[PDB]
Design a protein around this nucleic acid. Sequence first.
DNA 1: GCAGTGAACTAGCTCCGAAAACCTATAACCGGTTGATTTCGAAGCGTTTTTTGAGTTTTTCCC
Lengths: 94, 98
Amino acid sequence: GPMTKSELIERIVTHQGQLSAKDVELAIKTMLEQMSQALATGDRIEIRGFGSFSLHYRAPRVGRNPKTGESVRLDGKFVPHFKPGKELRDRVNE
Amino acid sequence: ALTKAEIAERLYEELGLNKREAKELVELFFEEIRQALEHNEQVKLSGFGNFDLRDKRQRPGRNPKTGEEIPITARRVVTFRPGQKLKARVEAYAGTKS
DNA sequence: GCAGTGAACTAGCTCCGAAAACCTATAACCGGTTGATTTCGAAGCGTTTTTTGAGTTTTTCCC
């Protein structure tokens, strides 16, 4: 089955129990907040080994509903993007 | 860029946890995420986009600067799907393309 | 309430030990290319789950 954030909390807490469990979740949800905020402010998120996690742009377009098929105008906007770093790349490549 | 050194700094500043152990905390969270995907254990996140692994099929490739064609072998690679909460947070900012 | 003791406290110090702060190279990441294949997504309602919050009961730790 899949791992979740709720399961990360406990597994980190087992492999780093010497830190307070709640200092751990505190840390971990603040650091997710930090990276998401960095994206929301239009910034890189670059690291080594892991990879880099970044932003991309979409131009305005006339899309419209898969259900109803009714014209919908859309303005230009940004979206997150992620490229895996060659260390993680090869770790996940069986 | 945002750097996990800057996360260690932010964690010291905002939580008060010493940067020495804060750096190990972030790097362990960053290592166990890798352990999950390395095991093909799909990592699943809310309030945030999440981590899938996609089994890409054979595709045509190229040398873009010569026009030569090279096949792209089928492979399993990690693909991260941003969530709507993250997209809504990220949709608009500044005034330049990225 | 008293006689009594022991704990908290004083200044400034060199001196000493440690975590803090700073410098470096460079491997991983950044940018540019082509283009047929697959992947992703425009709305939004219903379903399912998380994960946050919410309280606390219990357990564990430290003294």
